[PDB]
Amino acid sequence: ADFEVHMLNKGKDGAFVFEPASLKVAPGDTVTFIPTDKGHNVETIKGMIPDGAEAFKSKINENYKVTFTAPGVYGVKCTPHYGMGMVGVVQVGDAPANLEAVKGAKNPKKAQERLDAALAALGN
Numbered sequence: 340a341d342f343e344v345h346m347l348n349k350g351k352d353g354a355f356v357f358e359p360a361s362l363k364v365a366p367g368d369t370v371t372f373i374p375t376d377k378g379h380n381v382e383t384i385k386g387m388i389p390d391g392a393e394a395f396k397s398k399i400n401e402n403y404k405v406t407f408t409a410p411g412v413y414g415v416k417c418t419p420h421y422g423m424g425m426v427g428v429v430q431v432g433d434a435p436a437n438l439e440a441v442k443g444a445k446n447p448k449k450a451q452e453r454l455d456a457a458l459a460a461l462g463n
């Protein structure tokens with residue numbers, strides 16, 4: 340199954356957001372990260388990927404398709420806007436094994452508040 344996540348100058352929770360900020364997909368599904376507005380990318384947050392996952396970083400303005408082969412929860416950021424809160428989480432599969440590591444990982448305040456709301460929305 341194929342999903343999209345958008346990089347936006349403005350959205351639900353204010354400036355510099357991914358939408359949806361919280362998504363559940365199955366292992367093997369794809370997410371295309373679509374910069375609706377100019378100036379965004381996607382990159383995994385160091386410490387917020389599961390066992391055997393590869394880190395990734397797209398170029399600015401790239402429509403970037405990821406096939407999520409390793410199950411678990413992923414924290415993602417936009418590289419320039421991370422510190423302004425531009426984050427998302429992708430849960431790949433059921434009962435993610437790294438849920439504690441992701442809840443506990445250290446992030447700038449604005450990113451942590453948005454990560455916590457995205458994690459809460461997953462309802463683990």
Ligand SMILES: [Cu+2]
Binds near residue numbers: 378
């Ligand atoms: Cu951005």
